[PDB]
């Protein structure tokens, strides 16, 4: 609740990025955050499969209803109560909080770094980050330098 | 005591070469009826037993968690994430 209070609303665009680290993060968020109604699609289609077999070698409609409720109930049991999805969503919310904090600083200082950005991009053809390129320079000077 | 002379004679002398074949339809009908009361009712009970501690005590099933620290990359308009591994604990109670 506190972590989600910090992040007022989570947008679908920002979710997909965390699929780089953990897929099915949208599934975890749905399992933990009451975004929508999790209709048991898998259980309903399994029960329909039982309904097809129960309609071939005819079983009573009582058995049809029971074997329709059973897989839906199984999916509901395996869906709700999943508290590991809550930990996955805690990790995602920490990641998204940090991403939003950093992105907020990007817009504040976008005006200031506009002049340097042009020269840096035009004379350094590399999509690698400065935080990553500089550490390569640090270790390169550490290993092979006149010292 | 007891008078089980008939039953003792039955135990001593029984047919070793007598058998009756089973009707497979009725056999599988009985077995599937047993499975229906096994699966439904007893899986309700077994899932309650198995998942109640997993609902009211999740921290024991997720021992290790990750924590992120992000920094801007202004020139390329990127975000750089550093990760740390922590013990998933009861934070702030
Ligand atoms: C099933 C095979 C069979 O013979 O079923 C007939 C039996 C008895 O059906 P019955 O009593 O209706 O008779 C056989 C069908 N007629 C009427 C045509 C003669 O059905 C069952 O046992 C019900 C289905 C049980 C399914 C259990 C699933 C457990 C969970 C799986 C995951």
From TrEMBL, chain A:
The chain holds residues 149 to 295 of 296 of the full protein. The chain crosses the membrane at residues 37-57. Keywords: Membrane, Transmembrane, Transmembrane helix. The lineage of its organism: Eukaryota, Sar, Alveolata, Ciliophora, Intramacronucleata. The keyword Transmembrane helix applies. This is Transmembrane protein, putative.
UniProtKB/TrEMBL annotation, chain B:
The chain crosses the membrane at residues 32-50. It comes from the Eukaryota. Keywords: Membrane, Transmembrane, Transmembrane helix. This is Transmembrane protein, putative. It comes from Tetrahymena thermophila (strain SB210).
